[PDB]
Amino acid sequence: MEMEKEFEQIDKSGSWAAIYQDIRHEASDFPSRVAKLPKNKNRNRYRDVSPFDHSRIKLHQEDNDYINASLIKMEEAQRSYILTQGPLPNTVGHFWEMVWEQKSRGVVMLNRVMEKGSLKCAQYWPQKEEKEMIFEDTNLKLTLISEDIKSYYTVRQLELENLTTQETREILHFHYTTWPDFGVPESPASFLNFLFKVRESGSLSPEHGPVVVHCSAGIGRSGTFCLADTCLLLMDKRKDPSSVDIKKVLLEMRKFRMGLIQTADQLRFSYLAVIEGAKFIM
Ligand SMILES: CN1CCN(C(=O)Nc2ccc(F)cc2)CC1
C-alpha cells in the first residue's frame, strides 16, 4: 500500500502495536559473540543492546578492538551510517578514535546528557573554548571552536587532533536538544528541519566517512533518524515514489543493528516524518 493512506488505515483501526510486533517477529537474528566476551562488559551500556559481529565497527588496536557501534550500509539509497550507544566514562576515548579512523565529518546526538534524572551518556565534548580535552588512552585532543544555540538544536564546530601525527580535522556536532523525556514529538517539523541541517553540512555525503549517530542505546531515536533520511532519499531517486515501503526499509536496516525503532509510537512518528517531509521536498 501507499504510505499516507496505510497510515490513516492503521490509525482508524488502532493496530500500531500489531504492526510493530510483526516487525519484531520478522527481524534478523545474527550472532554478537564479541560484545558478550567478559572483557567487554564495561564497554556496553545495556546488556540487551549489542552490535552484530558481521557489521560491528572495529577499532584499529591490537589489544581490544571492540566498541558498541554498527555500520548500516544502504545499497540502493547509497548512504551509510554508523549507529552507536552514548559514550560511557570508560569509552569516550574509543568513541573519538572511531570518528578519526572512519573519517567521519559529523556526529549526530539525539539525547541530553541527563534525562529523567539519570545520566544517559558521558559529557564527551568540551563546553568552553579555553578548556580542551585530552584522551590519553587513544592519544587524541579535542577543542571547542564555536557553538550556535538555536531553539530546537545546537551546532558545534570541534577540532580533533591526532597527537601521534599532529594531523587535525574539523568535526561538526549536531545536537537535537528537545526530544521529550517521555514519548515522541507531537509534530515532526523540528526533527525534519534538523535532518535538513545535517544534510546541508555535507556530513551525510559520499566524500566523507559515514556520519556517527547516537542516542542513549543507539537504536530508538537513532533508528528514526536514519530510517527517515533513507526513505526520503529513495522517494527522490525512484520513478514511482509511492513504491517506497517503510516497513521493508526498516527490516533491511535491522539486518545491520538489532532493535531499531523501540516502540510503536516511534514507528508511527517515523511514518509521520516521511509523509510530511515528502511534501516539503517538492
Ligand atoms: C574549514 N574547512 C572545512 C573542512 N575541514 C575538515 O576538516 N573536513 C574533514 C575531512 C575529513 C574528515 F575525516 C573530517 C573532516 C576543515 C577545513
Swiss-Prot record:
One of its GO terms (biological process) is cellular response to nitric oxide. The modification Cysteine sulfinic acid (-SO2H) is found at C215. The modification Cysteine sulfenic acid (-SOH) is found at C215. The modification Cysteine persulfide is found at C215. GO terms for cellular component: cytoplasm; cytoplasmic side of endoplasmic reticulum membrane; cytosol; early endosome; endoplasmic reticulum; endosome lumen; glutamatergic synapse; mitochondrial crista. Keywords: Acetylation, Endoplasmic reticulum, Hydrolase, Membrane, Oxidation, Phosphoprotein, Protein phosphatase, S-nitrosylation. It is an enzyme of class 3 (hydrolase). This is Tyrosine-protein phosphatase non-receptor type 1. The lineage of its organism: Eukaryota, Metazoa, Chordata, Craniata, Vertebrata. The chain holds residues 1 to 282 of 435 of the full protein.
